[PDB]
Amino acid sequence: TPVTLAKVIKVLGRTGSRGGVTQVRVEFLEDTSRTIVRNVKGPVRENDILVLMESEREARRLR
Amino acid sequence: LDQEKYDRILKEVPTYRYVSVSVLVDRLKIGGSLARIALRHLEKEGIIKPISKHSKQAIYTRAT
Amino acid sequence: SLVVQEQGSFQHILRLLNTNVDGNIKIVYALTTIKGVGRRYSNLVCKKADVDLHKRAGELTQEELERIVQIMQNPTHYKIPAWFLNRQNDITDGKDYHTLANNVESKLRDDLERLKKIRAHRGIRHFWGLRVRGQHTKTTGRRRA
Amino acid sequence: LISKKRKLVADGVFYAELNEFFTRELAEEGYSGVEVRVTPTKTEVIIRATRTQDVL
Amino acid sequence: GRVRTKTVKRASKALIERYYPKLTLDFQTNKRLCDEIATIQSKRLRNKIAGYTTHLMKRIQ
Amino acid sequence: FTPVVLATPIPEEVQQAQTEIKLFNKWSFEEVEVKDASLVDYVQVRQPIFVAHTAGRYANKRFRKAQCPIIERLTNSLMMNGRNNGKKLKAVRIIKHTLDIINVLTDQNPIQVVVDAITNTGPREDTTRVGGGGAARRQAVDVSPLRRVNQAIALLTIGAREAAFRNIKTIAETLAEELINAAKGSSTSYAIKKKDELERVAKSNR
Amino acid sequence: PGVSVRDVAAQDFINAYASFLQRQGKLEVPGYVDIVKTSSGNEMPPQDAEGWFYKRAASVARHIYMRKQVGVGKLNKLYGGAKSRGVRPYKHIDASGSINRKVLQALEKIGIVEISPKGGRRISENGQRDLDRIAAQTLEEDE
Amino acid sequence: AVPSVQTFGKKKSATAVAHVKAGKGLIKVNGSPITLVEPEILRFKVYEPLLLVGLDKFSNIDIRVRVTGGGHVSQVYAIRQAIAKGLVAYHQKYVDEQSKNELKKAFTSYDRTLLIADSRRPEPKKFGGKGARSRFQKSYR
Amino acid sequence: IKIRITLTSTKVKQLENVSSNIVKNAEQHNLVKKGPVRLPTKVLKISTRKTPNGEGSKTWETYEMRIHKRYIDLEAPVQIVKRITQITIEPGVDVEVVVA
RNA sequence: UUAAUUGCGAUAACGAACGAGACCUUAACCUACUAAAUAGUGGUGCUAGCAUUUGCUGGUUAUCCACUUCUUAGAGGGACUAUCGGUUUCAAGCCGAUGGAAGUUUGAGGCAAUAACAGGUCUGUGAUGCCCUUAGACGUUCUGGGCCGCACGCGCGCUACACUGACGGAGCCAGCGAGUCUAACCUUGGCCGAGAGGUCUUGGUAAUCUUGUGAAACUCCGUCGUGCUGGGGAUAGAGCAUUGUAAUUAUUGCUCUUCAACGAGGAAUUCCUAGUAAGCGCAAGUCAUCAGCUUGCGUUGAUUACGUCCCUGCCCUUUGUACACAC
């Protein structure tokens, strides 16, 4: 079980056929020039904590 | 309660860091009724101390 | 402090009234297995016997079980009243009776034949295997045959 | 004699007795409505109609 | 569903065109002032109509 | 500890909770540490609750659910199975009962390690399914901060009563061993070997 | 000081009273104590069945205290409970009137209770004294 | 004219009449001490309005509370605020302002319901279901 | 003399008017008196199926109305009850005399 | 953008009407008014207890006095989305934090546009067009059965399938509503019987009496044990009572015995965004009697969103139509 971390700044919109999956812009603290979207199964909003397993591999709109 | 297990009970119950009715049943091959008398006898006898004797679960630990 | 170590008088199996009853359990709930004795009925015979209710079936001296047999044989002369017998006010003599495992099946079968020979409504329903209580078998009670 | 709740509803159905009976009998008389007033001893019933010369 | 209807909107703009210095930026002082110059025959209705005009004094500031 | 009594009999072992080192009514509350950065500001330990029985106005709004203490939220996730819907005082008694069961095995201040028992409970990543229709193509996503506190607290109880069906052991003695299990990453709890199967599709769907 | 039955625990009150009425059994012992279901809503007799008339006598003595007038219909309504009437759901039923009447007659035999004005039963002068006195000694038992 | 104030309190349907007066500081419910509340585990919770500010200033105030209506937790919720509301009333008659504000701040900082009544109230049930939003079980074919 | 008056009705305006008239006459002279005790109104509701048939979705309704009763008691000898015999009765409200 | 042609905006709209909205009721607050032994609070007198040394617990309408805080409704006040900061021609509108009883139209109901179904109804009328019967009448009345019935398939519901349990004890809290007169209701209390139940009386046309409906689910004590067992009461047998002119295919209740399936159930399907679901009980309805049903009421009281149009449907829209009592 490796370790990596980031966090969210602001929410944009939803994805998924049923509208449950949410992708939201995130940011990782050190070396603050780091910014990619990442989908989250649950609910997010501004100033939350992102958490994951791999380092950097984003996804996009779930059809 | 038999006799050959009486010696086992007295020499082995001050070795559980947690003692309870369910714990005695699982790891001693002792029924519920025989566990109730064992825990009430031990709490009255000495050593282990009744930190919380409550309804249906006598929460209990080891005292040395 | 109430603990008694085992001495050797405990027996696994018991043999009462031509029926098989298991031990290692409470005597108040031991006689309930035989046909014709329920939970409340077993409570009264045990209470009237004064045999230290909190006792296992296995640990029992042979001084008490046969007494339970004789008290339950004719309870009415022994102060258990008329409203504790299943066959209260019997249809043959009017006296009170309490059937046992060798009697609940014979008297019920005999009562079935009593109502059978008179061709009354309940007998033919019982003969057909149908409900005689007047319930609804349109949807309930279907997996019987 | 009778509970006020039962007295009032009995008044209401009695009130409904006049409404239909005045409507059914004095329909031609231009019947409009009935105002029922209760009073100790004597009581008065007020009727509304167009051809009042005929209702008398 | 806090969006107002037409009758409150049209009535609201009727006051300020001649009642600018009376529609004070406080709701409590003008929630009953409207009744004195606008004849409203409902306690419930007179509240939101006073509320809408009070809302515009906030933005018109 | 200002030992003053009033004209009603008050046993002074009750006035020691907050006019002292303000610890939970019978357990030390100050040494409570989070072992994961994922669930900061989402477990509402600090402030304390005397009994997790605040029937407050906490669930009407979207994100005011997590502002009650995790102890309070931990109560809620236990009354279900229909038979025990509602009847929350049935739970608050047992959680107050079982919290001393951690404070003996290398005491560790149970509330300190209650949070340590959430680091591996919540799924590290679950795989939401694309619309599709068929083989159910599930592409793996990371999870929200909330769903490692909000449904992970449902993962301590999603089937935790399957070890309480027609068996001798009571409810309160179970979570004690599973508590450190989520703290050490064990191989015999529920919430931490069903985190692993919840992400058996760990690094394949990217 | 100012101790009373109101200031003693309900479980403490019965256990202390259970000892007193079992250590002294002058009052009486009915003939059918061992065959009572205590209500039609019950299913099995109490498993104690050795005393169990002192436990009931203590509770009604407590019930008589902070209440003013209690008739036979008051106890059976309170002492009743739900019964599994077949597959039909639970329903509240009254308790046994005869046992309530017999225990009430027991309280009149000793003299702690008596017939009250406007019906019901009240607290006798001597009954109130003792109920307070035994309430005083049970507090220092745990002291 | 014995120093005395009166307050009240509701949680769901309980009306806890907090009769407050002056005395040696004896606190009881229905004439019974607070060592006997009901559930044996909310006993620490009903002590909350007393301990949050301490028993130091409770030695000269005594409150009578009589409660009726709702379930056991409902009355227990009624006593805590009624004696708390009665405490504010006593601070609203005799003791200085600076002391009063600190206790009131301590009451509300921990939780808001000690001085604010719960506005939640079961609304009437509706036809077409057992409750208001619950509905009968409907079937197709 | 314990003459007591009773006022029962459904609509509220008429019973309010007569009670104010009664208390105004009571206010005249001295007539040491008690104010109008307000009995708690009981809503008389009945649940009825709207449809006369059985076909259609389940639809119930509540048919209810309110009854307000207020009683006023007078305390002095027969001097007052020779002028209060005048009936200030409106449709709806009803009056009744009760003594002792 | 809003639950909403609900609003800003537009362009040839300028304006207006119904509905929604608006209106009313219920649940929320009023220590600001009116008051109340048919609701109460405190004190003063009489009476009992504890320790008595100070106080506490109670009872008392002809023992009075002061008040409406709690319980009542009467007129009213009160939230209107108010303040700031973010989004928007910076307009409607949305979001987060700052008073509170309340910032999902405060919550929910009542009323609830035009228009259609050849939707149900002739078993609701003494209003029914038409046909039929119309005197051994299909009209009325009287006796006995039927509407309950089983080789079978489905839908509403209740017990369930053990320990967050079963059983026996103690503490053990309300609301809606109902209740007799020339008829015989709500039944308090006393006595008898284990119980159902019976007898003698009491009060009530009702905030007063039933009723503080002292209800169950709830907690503290105990017995039990992982055992189709103490779970479970389907299956019957015998006896004891009530209702009714009459109860047999037991109305129903009570006592004893007999103690089967059920072991959390495979496609699909149902209701649900807060006191909501769910659990539990109560009152009312049908009643001479009988709730496993319905309506209302109260109690305990979760998890959890704060969104979407690929399904299940609808709304506006585009376009085609040899159709216009219109697939």
3-state SS of C51-73 is CCCCCECCCCCCCCHHHHHHHHH
Q: Which residue of F has its CA nearest to B63?
A: F104
Taking an 8 Å cut-off on Cβ atoms, the answer to whether I67 and D4 are in contact is: yes
Q: What is the largest CA-CA distance in chain F?
A: 75
Task: List the single residue in I10, I69, I94 with the smallest CB-CB distance to D38.
Answer: I94
Cβ pair A49, F38 in contact under 8 A: yes
What's the rounded Cα separation, in Å, for the pair F197 and I20? 79
What's the rounded Cα separation, in Å, for the pair H74 and H51? 21
Residue entry with tokens 């203490």: F69
What's the rounded Cα separation, in Å, for the pair C57 and C13? 9
3-state secondary structure (DSSP) of residue B45: helix
Q: Which residue is nearest to nucleotide J4 (CA to C1')?
A: E1
Taking an 8 Å cut-off on Cβ atoms, the answer to whether C3 and B3 are in contact is: no
CA distances H57 to F135, H90, H115, Å, are 71, 11, 19
CB hemisphere CA count around F169 (13 angstroms): 17
Cβ pair C125, C131 in contact under 8 A: yes
Residue F189 burial class via C-beta count within 10 angstroms: exposed 0-12, middle 13-18, buried 19 and up: buried
Nearest Cα of chain H lies from the Cα of I57 at a distance, in angstroms, of: 9
The residue length of chain G stands at 143
All chains having 3 or more CB pairs closer than 8 angstroms to chain A: F
| Strand I60-63 versus strand G121-123 pairing type | unpaired
Per DSSP, the residues of H27-67 read: -EETTEETT--SSSSSHHHHTHHHHTT-STT-TTEEEEEE-
CB hemisphere CA count around F185 (13 angstroms): 6
- Kindly state the helix (H) or strand (E) to which residue G131 belongs, with its residue range: helix G125-141
Strands of the sheet with H32-33, listed across from one edge: H4-7, H17-22, H61-66, H28-29, H32-33
How many C-beta atoms surround the C-beta of residue G63 within 10 A? 14
Q: Which residue of H has its CA nearest to G7?
A: H32
Q: Judged by CB atoms within 8 Å, which residues 18-37 of H form the interface with G?
A: 28, 30-33, 35-36
Per DSSP, the residues of F117-158 read: TSTTTS-SEEEEEPS-SSS--EEEEEB-SGGGTTTHHHHTTS
Cβ pair F70, F49 in contact under 8 A: no
* Contact residues, chain F, for B51 at CB < 8 Å: 100
Q: Which residue is nearest to nucleotide J258 (CA to C1')?
A: C36
What's the rounded Cα separation, in Å, for the pair H136 and H127? 9
The single-letter code of the amino acid at G9 is: A
CB hemisphere CA count around E2 (13 angstroms): 3
What's the rounded Cα separation, in Å, for the pair F119 and F36? 6
In the beta sheet, which residues pair with residue G122?
G114
Q: Judged by CB atoms within 8 Å, which residues 13-32 of B form the interface with F?
A: 17-18, 20, 22-23, 25-26, 32
Residue C9 burial class via C-beta count within 10 angstroms: exposed 0-12, middle 13-18, buried 19 and up: exposed
What's the rounded Cα separation, in Å, for the pair H119 and A13? 35
What's the rounded Cα separation, in Å, for the pair H62 and G53? 40
Cβ pair C38, C98 in contact under 8 A: no
What's the rounded Cα separation, in Å, for the pair F8 and E27? 50
Taking an 8 Å cut-off on Cβ atoms, the answer to whether H32 and G9 are in contact is: no
What's the rounded Cα separation, in Å, for the pair G29 and G52? 10
Instruction: Answer positive or negative: Cα dihedral of G74, G80, G85, G91.
Output: positive
- Kindly state the helix (H) or strand (E) to which residue D9 belongs, with its residue range: helix D4-25
Q: Which structural technique was applied? A: cryo-EM
Nearest to F205 by CA among F154, F146, F149, F135: F135
Q: Which residue of G has its CA nearest to H33?
A: G7
What's the rounded Cα separation, in Å, for the pair B19 and B51? 11
Burial G68-86 (b: 16+ CB within 10 A, else e): eebeeebbbeebbeebeee
CA distances B10 to B43, G6, H118, Å, are 13, 44, 56
What's the rounded Cα separation, in Å, for the pair C38 and C34? 8
3-state secondary structure (DSSP) of residue H110: helix
- Kindly state the helix (H) or strand (E) to which residue B34 belongs, with its residue range: helix B32-45
What's the rounded Cα separation, in Å, for the pair F156 and F74? 9
> φ, ψ for residue G60 (rounded to 5)?
-65, -35
User: Do A and B touch (≥3 CB pairs < 8 Å)?
Assistant: no
- Kindly state the helix (H) or strand (E) to which residue A24 belongs, with its residue range: strand A22-27
In the beta sheet, which residues pair with residue H63?
H20
User: Do H and F touch (≥3 CB pairs < 8 Å)?
Assistant: yes
Taking an 8 Å cut-off on Cβ atoms, the answer to whether I91 and D35 are in contact is: yes
What's the rounded Cα separation, in Å, for the pair F193 and G132? 61
DSSP assignment letter at G82: B
**CB-based contact, A17 to chain F, within 8 Å:** yes
Residue entry with tokens 């009234």: C17
Q: For testing the chain C interface, which of G33, G34, G35 should be mutated: the one with the most C CBs within 10 Å?
A: G35
Residue F34 burial class via C-beta count within 10 angstroms: exposed 0-12, middle 13-18, buried 19 and up: middle
The single-letter code of the amino acid at F127 is: T
Per DSSP, the residues of H66-108 read: E--SS-HHHHHHHHHHHHHHHHHHHHTTTS-HHHHHHHHHHHH
At residue E24's C-alpha, the angle toward residues E19 and E25, to 5°, is 130
Three-state helix/strand/coil letters over chain E? CCCCCHHHHHHHHHHHCCCCCCCCCCHHHHCCHHHHHCCCCCCCHHHHHHHHHHHHHHHHC
Burial A29-54 (b: 16+ CB within 10 A, else e): eeeeeeeeebbbbbbbeeebbbbbbe
Q: What are the CB-based long-range contacts (under 8 Å, 24+) for C105-112?
A: C105/C35
CA distances G82 to D32, F7, F23, G93, H76, Å, are 59, 41, 43, 7, 26
Q: For testing the chain H interface, which of I58, I61, I63, I64 should be mutated: the one with the most H CBs within 10 Å?
A: I58
CATH number of the domain at D37, please: 3.30.300.20
* Contact residues, chain F, for H56 at CB < 8 Å: 2, 4
User: Do H and A touch (≥3 CB pairs < 8 Å)?
Assistant: no
In the beta sheet, which residues pair with residue F125?
F142
Taking an 8 Å cut-off on Cβ atoms, the answer to whether D8 and I8 are in contact is: yes
What's the rounded Cα separation, in Å, for the pair F37 and F55? 29
Residue H136 burial class via C-beta count within 10 angstroms: exposed 0-12, middle 13-18, buried 19 and up: exposed
Closest nt by CA–C1' to H85: J31
How many C-beta atoms surround the C-beta of residue I56 within 10 A? 9
The residue length of chain F stands at 206
Q: What are the CB-based long-range contacts (under 8 Å, 24+) for F15-24?
A: F15/H51, F15/H54, F15/H55, F17/F50, F17/H44, F17/H51, F18/H51, F18/H52, F19/H51, F19/H54, F22/F48, F23/F48, F24/F48, F24/F49, F24/F50, F24/F111
The residue length of chain H stands at 141
What's the rounded Cα separation, in Å, for the pair H83 and H47? 10
- Kindly state the helix (H) or strand (E) to which residue H7 belongs, with its residue range: strand H4-7
Cβ pair A34, A22 in contact under 8 A: no
What's the rounded Cα separation, in Å, for the pair B42 and B28? 15
- CA dihedral B34→B35→B41→B44, nearest 10 degrees, is -160
Burial H32-51 (b: 16+ CB within 10 A, else e): bbbebbebeebbbbbbbbbb
Start-to-end C-alpha separation, chain A: 30
Question: Which bases of strand J sit closer than 7 A to a protein CB?
Answer: 1-4, 6-8, 16, 20-24, 26-31, 34-36, 38, 41-43, 48-51, 54-60, 69-75, 77-84, 91-94, 96-97, 100-105, 107-111, 119-121, 124, 148-165, 167-181, 187-198, 205-207, 210-227, 229-240, 248-251, 253-259, 264, 269-282, 291-308, 310
DSSP assignment letter at G68: S
Cβ pair I16, I83 in contact under 8 A: no
- Kindly state the helix (H) or strand (E) to which residue G135 belongs, with its residue range: helix G125-141
Q: Which residue of B has its CA nearest to F94?
A: B57
Q: For testing the chain D interface, which of I5, I9, I94, I98 should be mutated: the one with the most D CBs within 10 Å?
A: I94
What's the rounded Cα separation, in Å, for the pair H118 and F183? 39
At residue D22's C-alpha, the angle toward residues D21 and D23, to 5°, is 90
What's the rounded Cα separation, in Å, for the pair I50 and I56? 10
At residue F56's C-alpha, the angle toward residues F52 and F59, to 5°, is 105
- Kindly state the helix (H) or strand (E) to which residue A8 belongs, with its residue range: strand A5-8
Total domain count, chain D:
1
Range of the domain at D26: 4-56
Q: What is the largest CA-CA distance in chain C?
A: 65
* Contact residues, chain I, for D40 at CB < 8 Å: 87, 95
Q: For testing the chain F interface, which of A40, A44, A45, A52 should be mutated: the one with the most F CBs within 10 Å?
A: A40
Q: What are the CB-based long-range contacts (under 8 Å, 24+) for F54-60?
A: F54/H111, F54/H113, F55/H73, F55/H77, F55/H118, F56/H111, F56/H112, F56/H113, F56/H118, F57/H118, F57/H119, F57/H120
Which token pair is G129?
Answer: 């004294």
Nearest to D18 by CA among D52, D56, D48: D48
Cβ pair A45, A7 in contact under 8 A: no
Which residues have a Cβ under 8 Å from the Cβ of C17 and sit 6 or more positions away?
C34, C69, C100, C101, C102
Task: List the single residue in I67, I87, I91 with the smallest CB-CB distance to D8.
Answer: I67
Instruction: Answer positive or negative: Cα dihedral of F158, F163, F164, F166.
Output: positive
* Contact residues, chain I, for D35 at CB < 8 Å: 91
What's the rounded Cα separation, in Å, for the pair G7 and G3? 6
What does CATH list as the number for B1-63? Answer: 1.10.10.10
Total domain count, chain G:
1
Range of the domain at G24: 1-143
- Kindly state the helix (H) or strand (E) to which residue G106 belongs, with its residue range: helix G97-110
Which token pair is H37?
Answer: 């509340």
* Contact residues, chain B, for F105 at CB < 8 Å: 17-18
CB hemisphere CA count around C88 (13 angstroms): 8
At residue H96's C-alpha, the angle toward residues H95 and H100, to 5°, is 85
Rounded CA Rg of chain F: 19
Residue entry with tokens 């009130």: D15
In the beta sheet, which residues pair with residue A8?
A26
I38 CA to J73 C1' distance (Å): 7
Cβ pair F142, F206 in contact under 8 A: no
What's the rounded Cα separation, in Å, for the pair F145 and A45? 10
Q: Where are the domains of chain F?
A: 1-206
Range of the domain at H20: 1-141
| Strand H28-29 versus strand H61-66 pairing type | parallel
Burial F79-98 (b: 16+ CB within 10 A, else e): beeeeeeeebbebbbbbbbb
Crossing angle of the two packed helices B32-45 and B21-28, in degrees rounded to 10: 120
Alpha helices in F32-191 (DSSP H): 70-76, 89-98, 110-116, 152-155, 174-184
What's the rounded Cα separation, in Å, for the pair G141 and G138? 5
Nearest to H76 by CA among H63, H87, H65: H65
Three-state helix/strand/coil letters over chain I? CCCEEEEEECCHHHHHHHHHHHHHHHHCCCCCCCCCEECCCEECCEEEECCCCCCCCCCEEEECCEEEEEEEECCCCCCCCCCCCCCCCCCCCEEEEECC
What's the rounded Cα separation, in Å, for the pair C45 and C37? 10
What's the rounded Cα separation, in Å, for the pair F53 and F66? 15
How many C-beta atoms surround the C-beta of residue G36 within 10 A? 19
User: Do I and E touch (≥3 CB pairs < 8 Å)?
Assistant: no
Burial H61-100 (b: 16+ CB within 10 A, else e): bbbbbebeebeebbbbbbbbbbbbbbbbbbbeeeeeeeeb
